[PDB]
Design a protein around this ligand. Sequence first.
Ligand SMILES: OC[C@H]1O[C@H](Oc2c[nH]c3ccc(Br)c(Cl)c23)[C@@H](O)[C@@H](O)[C@@H]1O
Ligand SMILES: OC[C@H]1O[C@H](Oc2c[nH]c3ccc(Br)c(Cl)c23)[C@@H](O)[C@@H](O)[C@@H]1O
Ligand SMILES: OC[C@H]1O[C@H](Oc2c[nH]c3ccc(Br)c(Cl)c23)[C@@H](O)[C@@H](O)[C@@H]1O
Ligand SMILES: OC[C@H]1O[C@H](Oc2c[nH]c3ccc(Br)c(Cl)c23)[C@@H](O)[C@@H](O)[C@@H]1O
Ligand SMILES: [Ca+2]
Ligand SMILES: [Ca+2]
Ligand SMILES: [Ca+2]
Ligand SMILES: [Ca+2]
Ligand SMILES: [Mn+2]
Ligand SMILES: [Mn+2]
Ligand SMILES: [Mn+2]
Ligand SMILES: [Mn+2]
Lengths: 233, 233, 233, 233
Amino acid sequence: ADTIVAVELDTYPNTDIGDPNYPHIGIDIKSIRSKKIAKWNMQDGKVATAHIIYNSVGKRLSAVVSYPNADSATVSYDVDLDNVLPEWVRVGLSATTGLYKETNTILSWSFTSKLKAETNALHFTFNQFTKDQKDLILQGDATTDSDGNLQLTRVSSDGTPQGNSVGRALFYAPVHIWESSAVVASFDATFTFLIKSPDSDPADGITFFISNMDSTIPSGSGGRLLGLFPDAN
Amino acid sequence: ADTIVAVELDTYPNTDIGDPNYPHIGIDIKSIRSKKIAKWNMQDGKVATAHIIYNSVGKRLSAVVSYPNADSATVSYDVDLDNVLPEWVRVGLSATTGLYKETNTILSWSFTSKLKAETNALHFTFNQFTKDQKDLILQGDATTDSDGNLQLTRVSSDGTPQGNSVGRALFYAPVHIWESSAVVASFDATFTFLIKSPDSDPADGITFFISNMDSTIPSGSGGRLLGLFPDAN
Amino acid sequence: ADTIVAVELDTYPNTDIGDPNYPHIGIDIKSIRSKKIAKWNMQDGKVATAHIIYNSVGKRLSAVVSYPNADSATVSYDVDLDNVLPEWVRVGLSATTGLYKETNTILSWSFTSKLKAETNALHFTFNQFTKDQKDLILQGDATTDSDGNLQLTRVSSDGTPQGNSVGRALFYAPVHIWESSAVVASFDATFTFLIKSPDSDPADGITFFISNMDSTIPSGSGGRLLGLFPDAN
Amino acid sequence: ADTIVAVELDTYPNTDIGDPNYPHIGIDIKSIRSKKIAKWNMQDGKVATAHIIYNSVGKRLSAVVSYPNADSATVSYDVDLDNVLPEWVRVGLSATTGLYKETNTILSWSFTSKLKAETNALHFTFNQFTKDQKDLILQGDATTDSDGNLQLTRVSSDGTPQGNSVGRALFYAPVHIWESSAVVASFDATFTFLIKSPDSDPADGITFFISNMDSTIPSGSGGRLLGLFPDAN
Ligand SMILES: OC[C@H]1O[C@H](Oc2c[nH]c3ccc(Br)c(Cl)c23)[C@@H](O)[C@@H](O)[C@@H]1O
Ligand SMILES: OC[C@H]1O[C@H](Oc2c[nH]c3ccc(Br)c(Cl)c23)[C@@H](O)[C@@H](O)[C@@H]1O
Ligand SMILES: OC[C@H]1O[C@H](Oc2c[nH]c3ccc(Br)c(Cl)c23)[C@@H](O)[C@@H](O)[C@@H]1O
Ligand SMILES: OC[C@H]1O[C@H](Oc2c[nH]c3ccc(Br)c(Cl)c23)[C@@H](O)[C@@H](O)[C@@H]1O
Ligand SMILES: [Ca+2]
Ligand SMILES: [Ca+2]
Ligand SMILES: [Ca+2]
Ligand SMILES: [Ca+2]
Ligand SMILES: [Mn+2]
Ligand SMILES: [Mn+2]
Ligand SMILES: [Mn+2]
Ligand SMILES: [Mn+2]
């Protein structure tokens, strides 16, 4: 089994697995049952920006999603991620649709990890994605579209979202998330994303996740499990 | 009166103003009486590195000081700094000696502030300081030495620390610490510093601080008040 | 007299002072008479992005302006800027209108200077400008508009460009452009800009410039002299 | 055959393959026969810092090596690297010893590539290397030592350099060096390195190189060919 820490922009309330009754930004530590969620007013067809921030000192994982109108949801959770994740991880984004659907279009994604000036660093930014993103590991239905967008989940050539889709994109390089001689490890990610749904109910969301390097889509992870967990423990 | 948030590497226990009975890393919000301290084992004549991290989402200000031997003290405090500081601040380092003394030598200092990709950013790094640091505002006894070091407090040409010294160095540019249309503001600072003392009691420490732009050394701030406060309320 | 190095996005051919017969991107060293220009197809009312790159090793100053349609002009000039500029400079943007006019709207501007890991660094980014940009020194008619844009030159509240306008914006902090113990100094700037003109002839352009710290708008610099020179030597 | 662009810190004059009669910093485009070299005064057992800078606009590849005493060699060569390298490359460091030997110890290495703010970016920094650098692809004799150093070539446990060694370290992620919709691509690398030799003749040097993603050590590349070419055409 994989080790996952994720920030989930969960668009669809699967009450049977813990979701509150609304679209929510969630922090998931090792289970889809978010440790802490916050109500997220999903704005259909509008570009959101998610920032995820953490440092080893503060031991607080935070996520804020905003929409250009200045609306945001935020979630923070105290967690010491060195205690959680292996040292090397890959970082990535996940999406699923299920019975309900949405585009899970990533417009841009940037990530910075620092292991501290005898600091190590990884930083990447995609403001554009290409037909053949060699530094991204595309899993499941993830593809880059004609528009330099990352479609984490299947969209018909007419960009109608498809259901029962799971996709992920991990950065090609493993990331050294916390070393035992490390004083401080911090990371921050940002991606902007377009969730549009013909459905008045979008499903299921997009995560940014940190996983064990080897992580692949868990069979069973479609839909509400956001391509991250093989079940909802 | 100035508005100060500071991370104090306080080398000298002034019990009468709240210090615990030891050298301590402290988070000071608007008073020298640290909101949260942590024991710091002061390693004389050894270079320390302090990192200070904060983001508006997590609302947690963290500081970790380490010495090359892998020894560290850390302090975190939940504070929402937008609630505290004006929007524009200057950032800086402070030191004082008092009756007891130490070199308050800054070897390097880097700082990053981000107001979030429609992000604004300021970043600076001094791994070296020059005779005439035009992007630093030197206050009090702060000078740059023949060694490209920032001596926040007076050192005789033989580098014997002097007592009753206060100095500061603020970066020349004001920093836009939190804007009201801002979704996320984060900053992180790092400086390395050489506290050496002939005295078996060093005094008084070095801070990294965030202040109102106009901040000058408060008369009365020498010694235990680390060039930051005009009294110990 | 000031010392100026500038990359000029010159929209108006003032043949009497050297301009080629077209809108041109120019590299100006110490005179408005560009050392090297390249034809620039000015795209009215379309956002351009200018990048300016230099490092002390290569001793080549390059500028590329592009428009979202993938059209670009580029200009490079071999120059050793340490030989030219003082050590400390301020960096900035300039615009003028003259008899002919245009909006000289800066949407964003980022700048990085490095004096090299015993590297020093300044980096700033404005993706937004505010009513009171405390880290920008606004000169002449430069103001920030209701839209978080930098209007280097006067625009009526209806955003009609005005003529005979000069404005500049320098970053508040001096920049240490080349030190004598320095091995490598590099800088890169990027700004995006909206030149729109009711006129079928826009005038006069926008520069990014490096100047002596103290630089103010030279009396006489309006119009074709882009707020940079007091004459056209 | 691989495609290589390299900056070679060549410590040993192999006159039969073009080297000038001295240790030299060289720019190698697609052959070990440097397009442009500059005399390098090899300082035994002293840490050097190499910076390599390039941008697509200037089309000038520059390298400067310095030693803490302020001594440097520099080499620049006009080359348009998009014309040369595929779009995706891996970046790396190479070293060899041959009959003559040296430690080819990398202390730190940082790299930045930008494909331009709709900029893409990769940045990494190793100020330390670990026993199991998962984001580095170690080839040949490259290992990380007990000291967090990258020993590109074999060193006995007593750190005596061995002869006939070749090693490389490529960053795990492919790098998107130039895209056809790209306006500007720039990269800069920096690494610091300790060449120490018991021999009064060190051999053979260290390169920073850009290669086709798939690049492995070319059989035949030991010694003077710096692990980069299968012959000296
Ligand atoms: O995409 C939204 C949800 O669709 C499915 O769950 C259902 C939501 N409403 C339903 C109604 C009937 C049936 Br059968 C199902 Cl599975 C569902 C499942 O695929 C869930 O994983 C997913 O979260
Ligand atoms: O530098 C250490 C301390 O020196 C002075 O305080 C004293 C510490 N021990 C003392 C003993 C006698 C007297 Br008088 C004084 Cl002020 C002190 C004061 O300057 C304090 O501000 C400072 O923290
Ligand atoms: O803004 C475009 C140009 O306007 C003026 O120059 C003229 C261009 N065409 C003209 C026609 C008549 C007169 Br008078 C003038 Cl000054 C001009 C001057 O203000 C120039 O500085 C400026 O470059
Ligand atoms: O390491 C320095 C050089 O050693 C060898 O070349 C020689 C330099 N001096 C020699 C003397 C005799 C013989 Br045989 C050889 Cl191969 C050499 C070869 O391995 C060269 O590749 C290498 O550059
Ligand atoms: Ca859900
Ligand atoms: Ca004290
Ligand atoms: Ca002109
Ligand atoms: Ca050689
Ligand atoms: Mn959920
Ligand atoms: Mn204290
Ligand atoms: Mn011109
Ligand atoms: Mn050579």
